[PDB]
Structure formats: structure tokens, C-alpha cells
Design a protein around this nucleic acid. Structure first.
Ligand SMILES: [Mg+2]
Ligand SMILES: [Mg+2]
Ligand SMILES: [Mg+2]
Ligand SMILES: [Mg+2]
Ligand SMILES: [Mg+2]
Ligand SMILES: [Mg+2]
Ligand SMILES: [Mg+2]
Ligand SMILES: [Mg+2]
Ligand SMILES: [Mg+2]
Ligand SMILES: [Mg+2]
Ligand SMILES: [Mg+2]
Ligand SMILES: [Mg+2]
Ligand SMILES: [Mg+2]
Ligand SMILES: [Mg+2]
Ligand SMILES: [Mg+2]
Ligand SMILES: [Mg+2]
Ligand SMILES: [Mg+2]
Ligand SMILES: [Mg+2]
Ligand SMILES: [Mg+2]
Ligand SMILES: [Mg+2]
Ligand SMILES: [Mg+2]
Ligand SMILES: [Mg+2]
Ligand SMILES: [Mg+2]
Ligand SMILES: [Mg+2]
Ligand SMILES: [Mg+2]
Lengths: 242, 125, 98, 173
RNA sequence: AUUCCGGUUGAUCCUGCCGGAGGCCACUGCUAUGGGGGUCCGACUAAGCCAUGCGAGUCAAGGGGGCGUCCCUUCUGGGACGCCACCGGCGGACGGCUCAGUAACACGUCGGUAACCUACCCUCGGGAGGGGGAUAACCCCGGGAAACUGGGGCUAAUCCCCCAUAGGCCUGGGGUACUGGAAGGUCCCCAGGCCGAAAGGGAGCCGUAAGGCUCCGCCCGAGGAUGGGCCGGCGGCCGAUUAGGUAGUUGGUGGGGUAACGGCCCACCAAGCCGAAGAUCGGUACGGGCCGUGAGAGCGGGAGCCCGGAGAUGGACACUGAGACACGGGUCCAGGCCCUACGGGGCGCAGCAGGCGCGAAACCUCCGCAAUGCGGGAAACCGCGACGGGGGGACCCCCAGUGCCGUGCCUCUGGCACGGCUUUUCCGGAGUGUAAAAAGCUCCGGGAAUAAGGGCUGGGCAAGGCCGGUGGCAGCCGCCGCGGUAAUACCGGCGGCCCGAGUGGUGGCCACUAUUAUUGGGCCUAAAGCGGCCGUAGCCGGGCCCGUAAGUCCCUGGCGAAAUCCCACGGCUCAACCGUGGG
RNA sequence: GGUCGGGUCGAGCCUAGGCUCCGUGAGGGGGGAGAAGUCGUAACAAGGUAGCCGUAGGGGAACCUACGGCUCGAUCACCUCCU
RNA sequence: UGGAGGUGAUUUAAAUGCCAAA
């Protein structure tokens, strides 16, 4: 990148969370800017071709996508560079199957089958919260999307809470607070994909991130970063997890 | 032309051999010496990222504010003094922090005319 | 290295050996310096003519220098007019351009 | 830095002319009918590697060490080099002859499919021997214990007929 | 394999260096049957110079034209269909090549930006009102040796320009709604100014028409994402026969400039800043992941694949754009070269092939967009010397061949004579394979038929006390040493030994070497204790009690890309190679 | 876009001075090999004047002499100090 | 028995190594 942005991506330099063969070819698909970041998303082409196996070559994968056979969060996606990330819902209505994208026990993305009824809701972590013109509150979620609420409910939402959103209408139906006893699922780090209940919260001076302690089903305690803990229920999960 | 990249001298006094050509994003521009004149004169500069700056070269009016929060548009007579440079007052150069005299008294400039395109001052009691 | 032959000489062995070792003076193409090169083999000097071009390499003594009873000679002849000298000594081949 | 360069899989002797080593290796070469010394050396290296793994794991402790120890034992007794009740110490008593007995050429000779080692090598190279329904033409392939008994003449070979003149000569031994 | 062997004497024991014996890399002599896999092949001298062909396009669903074929009527026309250039949009700043410069915030690693920019993409909240204008294409006339280029006429747009509104920025006075560890930040209300949007456009159906209903689109605000800019602490070469260096230099105050902080640049006020724990200067080099060697501690290198930096004949400087001071875009100087009708006009392969030169030192002026990706398009698609496929080459690694069996004879290892067998390999066919081919793989016919060399032969060091030449001559010899007419050492014959599709020569690095010694060496007589003493920094420092927790030890969060290394299992016949897991 | 004026930056070019590198070079100087053209016998035994270190003077050449020092000096007689 | 020091002295002149070993 001597004079401008990069447009290519070698196979050997691909993100380490993909299921891909790094020596079979030279190039890989450089993902388009979109909802999630690089470390927690994968292009749609690899889901269509390599994961599910509905296509053998890239050319016939693009023909499937252009016909609108794939839904991501209830919206038709035609771009083969579109990034798909954590907690998303992939629906194929013609075959009537649904999946949720989740990290593995070693940090790789996998598709977890879910029921049709559960496919209508998506959990969103409140990543930031700000005031906006006209004196309204804007919520910024972990996947980059935004929502607006009036000044009256400013005390019902804080950062690290989880909102259950009905897609594609984008209508709020539940708020899950972040506190002791809440049920959480870990998304990054050494303890990725472990789940449990919150026990303690600690804070540090001068901008160092804060840490939480979690107890699992077997009764073991482990620590992780607060921002890596994803609230999924009050005392039981509200969604299916592997 | 005007290059603002780095110094060619180490803090210990040793010299530095330049290791690359000058990048376009490191260049400066000619200073705008805002004079006092009968009529105002300004231009528009296209800047990095395709943005814009309004550069004022000649000034005739000013906005003067009082401690009560009210402002009036009055014209400039002359520059009494300017701590920035020793000979700006003689040449009637207006910069931030200069003292000017208007039809309603002395005032001190609070804006940057070369960056904003307007002259704002607070009234001196 | 590659060079051009200037003249033929002979060097006496050191004590207590006796004999004459046949060598040539070679001017190097790459920088113009003049060195001395030994011609290995029985009667090998008869295949060398003045103004021929030769390929020389190290003679293989201790510390990358001279060997045996002929100090002062650090190189030996390998090719003559792009033909291996060892073949010419054994036969199996004829020196080109007469 | 530098990219990967593929390396030799065998080691050469530290000194090329030692009388005792020459005699021992000549005896082995004559007995097992190998083509050249390097082939023999290849097998030697294999043996050494096993020993070097046993020595390192004896002086180790932890969680990964136990996994590697059991993996080494399982691999060694899968090849048929150790009995089913062997322990780690028994690794240090293997010899070069133990590995040479596992070559496909030797096993073909011992099973009675051939009269001589050289005939066994020729039979393997020309493609008359099938192992578990597959034709293999490498005389140095090491045979696993689980597949040793399923070694026969290829079902398409001329030798897969008891009336063949050459097979009857083999059976005569 | 955590190793020794030869050399100083008439004989002995030491110190000490030289040589042998091992691995890897570059060049090279002689000699060569086959297949597979891989990140190999003008890097070292010349980042020297280059003939010819190619290496970046795409959009007809943005807009007016030209030409052709048909249908309806047609004087005239209107349609439909297909090609062509032009205006217009996006891209051409990525990809590809090389290592000259650079000892530096260039690179590795942990952090920061509350001091910043970002076209394409995602979510939410809003908007699209009213006018104006030229010109290419096309027609008439041209100029010039050419490169290029003039005048007049006529026309459209998602082309260009105005007005309004929304919106943006600066400063002064209040209120305390948000995030955060902490507000020169965000939100609300007054006040003075300056800047200042848009294309309801295109396509298809239902529409008699009216108008819907989808598809692609245009503008503003808030946030994200992607790609970057800038800053800090720590870490990694050699020289004292280089000891003092610096004067916008170091800091402060007031400004300018920038996307943004900053002596980045000015005006004024001070005398600071670096240094024997090595400043300054000189030498040599792109940095890292890694690679070679060794029991390890270490020592040496960092061309090929990935990540970061820099460059486009040398030295300077700008236009457009979201992004450049731009390898196949522009200007000047310097230095080469080419075409001219002599007035002028052009060109630098460190892109793929190919040529000259320099050298010890390095390949075809080939086929394809079928796969992997990128740019363009609503899409089908089009282009791509990237990438993929072959051609030449003792580049590296893995698996094989040059026959096998039985009975006799011999000098019994090995050769010969009879009888039999097989076809890896070889010759000729069918299928499969491939973008098309070629290899490869499965079958069919013939037949032991088509296939062994290089070095050594006195000791070190495995192998002849045999024959013929030469006669201190010729020659050999890493080292020790042979040759003076009865040579196991030179030349040749016949034997023999080592490795084997390879085997020898020359140069370099590691080991050998405890001849660089932390582990782990020496200084009476062998190299080596200053002629003697006093003392500054540094290093090393007596016993007990109380406190602290910097060093040190244990547990646990966030990091140190992938490739490369080790192990088990799985896929190509096994392997080399590749995939899933654990380290 | 042309012409003039002003300010500022600036590759290159010329002159002078000072350091530094490469190629030749009359003449001078020791060093290393060779084998003997030459004059002597200085080091080894008490080497025929014991050898050697420091400083100074002299001589064809190894070398000689003076003052202070060492044993890495042979023989005889006497004396002294020890085991 | 074997050692370490000190003081005295110490009668003319007397150079060289060819041929060979080869
Ligand atoms: Mg490198
Ligand atoms: Mg001696
Ligand atoms: Mg070149
Ligand atoms: Mg570029
Ligand atoms: Mg360089
Ligand atoms: Mg306007
Ligand atoms: Mg380096
Ligand atoms: Mg290269
Ligand atoms: Mg070429
Ligand atoms: Mg080569
Ligand atoms: Mg012989
Ligand atoms: Mg022997
Ligand atoms: Mg040595
Ligand atoms: Mg020593
Ligand atoms: Mg002393
Ligand atoms: Mg002394
Ligand atoms: Mg103490
Ligand atoms: Mg501590
Ligand atoms: Mg890694
Ligand atoms: Mg298999
Ligand atoms: Mg396997
Ligand atoms: Mg792999
Ligand atoms: Mg004398
Ligand atoms: Mg004397
Ligand atoms: Mg005298």
C-alpha cells in the first residue's frame, strides 16, 4: 500500500477464524466493508460454496445469489463479498433451513442449526449510547447497526446490555440487563465459547479494561474481559446454544 | 515548497540523512496576511480529503462581543499592536490576539482569519 | 577465473627435492593483473601456446594458498581454449583450432 | 530469512572407512538383499528416531508428555514391533534387524510366496503381489500387523493359478 | 557418537599451530534409464543499455448520432433488430518487478490519538422545489514531411452553472441531557457572521387512459466498517591510530500553516541540549517471521515464500482525485539514443518472453481466461504475460530399473552351458484424463529384449609385496613424504576397495577447537602480572531485630498473524506432499 | 493566457580557498627467499677475553670498550649458613 | 649423607671443512 488502499488478499494472510485451505490456491476473497469487523465475520461466498456445498465453482455460486435464494437477518443479500458474523441468522426458505453463526471452541466460525421460530429474533449487544439532535438517544450495537429511542426511556438502556430485536422489522421486544446472576456466552479470548453466570465485576484505573468472573454449570470459576461477555438471558439462555 | 515533515537535526546535534522523497500530504501553504482594507476579499482552498477552507485576505468589518453576550457588526479602523510579530502593526496585519480599534472602542481578536474567513473580537473595557 | 597466456616459464622445486615444474604467466581479463599458474600432468605444457585463453582456479594448499614443493604458485590451469586439460593429457580429445 | 528447503531423510556415517562397521553392514546387505547402502541407512535412521523419542519422554512430566508417550507405544505396537503388553523401557532394546523384518520383500519371502529374496523383490516390482486388495510396488514398504495375513498374489496375475509352471516350482520348496 | 588420528627427537613427555575425517551453499571435469512432489533457475560483476509483440479495461438499463436487415403503412414516416465511434460514469494509487538509498521511530512488540482524513460497503433519521448554458459526435473548408492542430454551422444527457430551503464552520453568554478513568467532546436556548445540496434519472409490467407495483439509482445528518496518517516506552552491528559536539541549536511566550499535535516555520525572551554507561564522525548493510551447523551453551547468514519499507536513467517541481507529487500520465536541468523534407518531433523493460554488454556464473520472442481472484455491469457476461498449462535445465526431496528360477562345469564370490518364467522399463494400439493437448492411470500384442559410471589403491584410511616402461629426468605430493637403473608411492596393463545415476575439483560458513573458555582455558622455567605505591567511577562487601515489597518465586486475565518445526489419525499405491486435532 | 513590477524558495553553473582518493614517477630505504662470488670467526665446552640486559662512544662486518645489574656461568683453595 | 651462598685467583699462540652421502 504505497499510494492507496489494498484490494487483494493472499490465502496465507487470511483471517485465522475461517475454515479454508490455505495452500490450495493463491488468492482469497477480500471482504467488503459492512456490519462486523474482519476478525468476527466471513464472506458469503464461502458459506454458499465451501460450508454448505450448494455450489462447486464461484461462477455458479454467484448465479444462485443473484436469484435471491439467501436471506441474512431476513434481508436478501446478492453481494458475494458481504460479511456474515456472530449471532447472525442465515435462512434458506426454498429448502426451509436456518442457521446461527457462532464461534467454535477454538475460535472458528460454525453454523448451528436452529428452529424456524427462533430465526425471527437476533440478540444485539449495546456497544455505545449517545445523544443526537432533537434530543433523542441513539444506540450503537455490536454489529454496527443503530436505533433511536426517546428521552423518556433513557434509564432503561446502558452499555453491555442485550436487546432482542425482531428481524427484519427491527422492533424491540426484550431488554436483558448486565448484572450478577445473568447468563453470558464468551465470544473471544482463551475462554471462547464457554457459557455461564456472572459472579463478580472488577475495575481498574487509567483506562484499563474491566474484568468479569463467570461460573459454569460444573461450578468452576474463570475470568475474562467484560466486553467479551455476551448476555443471553436472565438465568437461562433465551436462544439455542451448542 | 513548504515542507513540514521532520527536522533534519537530532536532539543531540547530529545530522540526519533523508531516506525518502517528500510526500504530498506533508506540504504547507503560503501564509495569508490579512490586511485592513475598504472591502473584504476571500478565497476558498480545496484541502486533503476533498474538504474546504475559507481564507480571508482583506478585512473591512468585525464582530464585537460584550460580556452581556450581544454582538454588533462594525468596521475596522486600524491595528494598534500585535504581539505576534514586531512589525505587523505598521503593516496592518490582523492575526489572532491582535488589538484593533473600531468605531466603538478597542477590541481583541479571538478567531483565526486565515482558517475561518471571519474576524471576531471581544470588547476591551 | 579466465585469463590470457603471456609466456611459459619453469620453477625449481625446493630442497631437498629436484626438478623443474612447468608454469605459465596469465593476465586476468576482469582486472588486468598478472599471476602464475601451474600446469598439472605429464607433458601438459606441450598443449599450451602463447596467446591462448585459460581457466584457472586455486591449487588447494593449506589456508587457501600454495602446496607441496612449489611455494609462490597459488593457481593451476583447468581449461585451454574451452577444452578440459585433463582430457588433452589423457587423449580422448584434440585441441581445437590446431 | 530463508524459505523452507526439503531435507534428506537419512544420515551418513561419520567416517567412511571403518573396518568393523563395513563388515557388519556388508553382512546385513548380503542377508536382506538391499540395493545400496543408503537404503539400509534409511532404516537405521528410523530406529534412531524412535529411541530419541523414548529418551526424551522418560525424563519428562506433565500432561502432553503422557499423551505423546501413549501415542508412541500405540504406534510402535501397531507396526508389529512390540508385543501388546510392552512398556516404554522395551523401546530401548529394539535392533536394526527388527525393522528389516517388516519390509514387504522380507514378509513376502517368509510367507512362502517366493523361493528367494531376489525373486520376492522381482515379484513386488513387476506387480504380482496384492496387500489388502491393493497392488503395491515398493519393496521397502513396512507392513502393519493388522494387514499382514491379507497378502497374496494379485487376482489378475499369472501366478494366481496353481497350474502355472513357475508357481509349482515355488511350491516345491 | 557429548570421539579422534598424522606431523618438532637418535629415543621420551609437553605447549602450540597446520593437515585429515562430517554437513550445507555457489562455480566446474567426466558420465547418465524412469516416474512423482515442491515456496528452484541474470540475486553476487552492470539500479548498465535495449529492436520487435504483448502486460488495464468495462458499461447499449446515462445521451444524442452513423450504417445495415426486416414489419406496418409507406410520397414522407414509424417501429423492431444488429454493429460502430463519440460525449458521459467507474477503474487505471491495487496487482507485477528489483534491493540502489537508508544506522533511522526504518523494522519487531506493547500502548495512545480527548490531536486526524477516508470514494466503494452496512444501519437508522430526513430531502429531491424553480430557472439557465455550451459543446463532442455530425455537415462545409482546411494547415503540416510528420507528431499534431485551426475556422464556421447544428444538438442531448445521470454534462456544467445559478436561486431557494435543508445543512456546515467560527466567536461571545447561559442550562446541565450523554459517553467515559478523566471533557477544549456530544445535546438544549439566545446573539454576530461566513460558506452553502441534490438526477424522481433510467428499465419492465398492469394501465384504453388516468395512475400504480416492482428493479437499479441522486443529496444531507449520526454511527460503524475498510484503508491509512501521527506519537511514546522497550529490543537488535563494527572502529578511540575518531574526544569533545550543537547555535533554530534546547526550552519558554505570542502567532502562522496543516486533515491533525509538534521548532514544522516565524517574531521576541533565556542558556540550554548530547557525551568515556562512547556523543560526533567514519565503515558496512533494507528489517522480521526464518535458514545452515552443533549433544547443548553457542557461532554464521538473512536473494526466492509471507508481513513492513524504499525506487522507477541521476537531481529538483506540479495538475486531477477519496487516495499520487503517479513504472506502461505532465514540466525543467544533466547525460545518452532515434526519426526528419532540416523548420521540427520523440524514447529510458529494476513487467512477460527476447537481444547486446559484463563476467566463473542463470531458460520459450509458446497455449488459455476452464479454475483461484480483481476492475466494470441490474444481469448474462467481457478483460487480465496476475494466475493457471506446457517447453528448456544433473535446482531440492521421495519411490524404482539395468532381470528371476532350476540342473550341471569352472578358479566356485563370480562366470559359462542347457531348460523355463516375468514385463517395472522399451516399441505399437483402445479407454480415461485435459479449456484443447501432453504427461499420468486401467487394459491388449511383441520381446531379456532397450539401459553403469566416477574416484582411489605407501601411512592417516578400506583395498597388490604382481608384470612392463622412466632413471633426482619426467612426474606425484591437502600433511608426513616418494623418484639417484632391482620404484608395493610416477606412466601403463592385469587384479582389488568405496560409493553408485552419480562420482570428483575449486572457493565460503559451522563443527573439529576447552585455538575465545558464562557452562569451560591460561600467565616461575614454554605467548602472557604494569618497575613500585596512593586513590575517583564501577564491581564485590561482617552479625542480630523491626518494616517495605523494587529484584526473585507461585496463581490467573490480554497479547506475541499465517507459513515453517514435533506427534497421532486421515487422502493421493506407501512416501515426499496435503487436510483435521494436540503441542 | 501574454507583458511589467515586487517578495520568497530553488536544481544547476563559474571563481577562489581548504581537506581527501586514484594513476604514473627520477631518486633513496630496509624486508623475504635462492645458492655460494667474497672477507673474517661473534655464539654453543671455561667456545679458548663467561654469556646476557640498560645507557653512551667507537669500528670493513659479525663486534669492542666504560658505569650499574642478573645467573639463564666452568674449575681449584678457603670461609660462612643449613639438613 | 645431601644442599645453598661469599671472597680470591686460573703461565704465549692455535682460523677453517672440503671432497662424498646424491
Ligand atoms: Mg531478505
Ligand atoms: Mg625440540
Ligand atoms: Mg542487471
Ligand atoms: Mg503502484
Ligand atoms: Mg545497498
Ligand atoms: Mg447555492
Ligand atoms: Mg542485516
Ligand atoms: Mg530473485
Ligand atoms: Mg530471457
Ligand atoms: Mg547456475
Ligand atoms: Mg597402479
Ligand atoms: Mg588398510
Ligand atoms: Mg583445524
Ligand atoms: Mg591453551
Ligand atoms: Mg611486577
Ligand atoms: Mg615484569
Ligand atoms: Mg551480610
Ligand atoms: Mg516483585
Ligand atoms: Mg504461527
Ligand atoms: Mg490410499
Ligand atoms: Mg500416511
Ligand atoms: Mg499443512
Ligand atoms: Mg669465538
Ligand atoms: Mg667469548
Ligand atoms: Mg675503543
Amino acid at each position: 500500500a504505497r499510494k492507496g488502499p489494498k484490494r487483494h488478499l493472499k490465502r496465507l494472510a487470511a483471517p485465522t477464524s475461517w475454515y479454508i485451505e490455505r495452500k490450495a490456491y493463491k488468492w482469497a476473497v477480500r471482504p467488503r466493508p459492512g456490519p462486523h469487523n474482519m476478525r468476527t465475520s466471513i464472506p458469503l461466498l464461502y458459506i454458499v460454496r465451501d460450508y454448505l456445498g450448494y455450489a462447486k465453482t464461484a461462477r455458479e455460486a454467484r448465479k444462485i445469489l443473484n436469484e435471491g435464494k439467501f436471506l441474512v437477518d431476513g434481508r436478501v443479500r446478492k453481494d458475494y463479498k458481504f460479511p456474515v458474523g456472530i449471532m447472525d441468522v442465515v435462512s434458506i426458505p426454498e429448502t426451509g433451513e436456518h442457521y446461527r453463526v457462532l464461534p467454535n471452541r477454538i475460535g472458528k466460525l460454525i453454523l448451528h442449526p436452529i428452529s424456524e421460530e427462533e430465526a425471527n429474533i437476533k440478540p444485539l449487544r449495546i456497544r455505545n449510547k449517545r445523544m443526537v439532535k432533537g434530543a433523542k438517544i441513539q444506540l450503537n450495537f455490536h454489529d454496527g447497526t443503530n436505533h433511536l429511542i426517546p428521552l423518556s426511556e433513557k434509564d432503561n438502556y446502558f452499555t453491555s446490555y442485550t436487546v432482542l430485536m425482531k428481524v427484519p422489522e427491527r422492533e424491540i421486544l426484550e431488554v436483558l440487563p448486565f448484572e450478577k446472576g445473568a447468563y453470558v456466552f464468551v465470544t473471544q479470548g482463551k475462554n471462547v465459547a464457554r457459557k455461564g453466570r456472572i459472579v463478580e465485576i472488577k475495575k481498574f484505573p487509567m483506562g484499563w479494561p474491566d474484568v468479569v468472573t463467570i461460573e459454569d454449570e460444573e461450578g468452576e470459576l474463570f475470568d475474562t474481559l467484560k466486553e467479551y461477555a455476551f448476555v443471553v438471558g436472565r438465568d437461562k439462555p433465551r436462544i439455542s446454544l451448542p | 515548497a513548504i515542507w513540514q515533515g521532520r527536522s533534519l537535526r537530532k536532539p543531540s546535534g547530529g545530522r540526519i540523512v533523508l531516506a525518502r522523497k517528500k510526500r504530498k500530504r506533508e506540504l504547507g501553504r503560503e501564509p495569508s496576511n490579512t490586511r485592513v482594507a475598504e472591502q473584504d476579499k476571500r478565497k476558498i482552498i480545496r484541502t486533503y480529503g476533498g474538504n474546504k477552507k475559507v481564507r480571508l485576505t482583506a478585512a473591512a468589518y468585525a464582530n464585537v462581543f460584550d460580556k452581556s453576550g450581544k454582538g454588533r457588526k462594525v468596521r475596522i479602523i486600524r491595528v494598534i499592536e500585535n504581539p505576534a510579530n514586531r512589525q505587523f502593526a505598521r503593516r496592518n496585519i490582523i492575526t489572532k490576539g491582535a488589538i484593533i480599534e473600531t468605531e466603538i472602542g478597542k477590541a481583541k481578536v479571538t478567531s483565526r482569519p486565515g482558517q475561518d474567513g471571519v474576524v471576531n473580537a471581544i470588547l476591551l473595557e | 577465473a579466465r585469463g590470457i597466456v603471456l609466456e611459459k616459464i619453469a620453477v625449481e622445486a625446493k630442497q631437498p627435492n629436484s626438478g623443474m615444474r612447468k608454469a605459465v604467466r596469465v593476465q586476468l581479463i576482469k582486472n588486468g593483473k598478472v599471476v602464475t599458474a601451474f600446469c598439472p600432468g605429464d607433458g601438459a605444457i606441450k598443449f599450451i601456446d602463447e596467446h591462448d585463453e585459460v581457466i584457472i582456479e586455486g591449487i588447494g594448499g593449506p589456508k587457501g594458498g600454495s602446496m607441496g614443493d612449489i611455494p609462490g604458485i597459488r593457481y593451476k590451469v583447468v581449461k585451454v581454449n574451452r577444452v578440459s586439460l585433463k582430457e588433452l593429457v589423457k587423449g580422448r580429445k584434440e585441441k581445437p583450432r590446431r | 530469512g530463508d524459505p523452507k528447503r526439503q531435507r534428506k531423510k537419512y544420515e551418513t556415517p561419520p567416517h567412511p572407512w571403518i573396518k568393523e562397521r563395513l563388515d557388519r553392514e556388508r553382512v546385513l546387505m548380503d542377508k536382506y538383499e538391499l540395493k545400496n547402502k543408503k537404503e539400509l541407512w534409511k532404516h537405521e535412521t528410523q530406529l534412531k528416531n524412535f529411541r530419541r523419542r523414548a529418551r526424551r519422554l522418560l525424563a519428562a512430566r506433565g500432561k502432553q508428555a503422557e499423551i505423546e508417550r501413549e501415542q508412541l507405544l500405540a504406534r510402535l505396537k501397531r507396526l508389529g514391533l512390540l508385543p501388546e503388553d510392552a512398556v516404554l523401557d522395551d523401546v530401548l532394546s529394539l535392533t536394526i534387524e527388527d525393522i528389516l523384518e517388516r519390509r514387504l520383500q522380507t514378509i513376502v519371502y517368509k510367507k512362502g510366496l517366493a523361493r528367494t529374496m531376489r525373486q520376492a523383490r522381482q515379484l513386488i516390482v513387476h506387480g504380482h503381489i496384492e496387500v489388502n486388495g491393493q497392488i503395491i510396488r515398493s519393496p521397502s514398504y513396512l507392513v502393519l500387523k493388522e494387514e499382514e495375513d491379507t497378502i497374496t498374489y494379485a487376482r489378475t496375475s499369472p501366478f494366481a493359478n496353481p497350474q502355472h509352471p513357475e508357481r509349482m516350482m515355488i511350491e516345491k520348496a
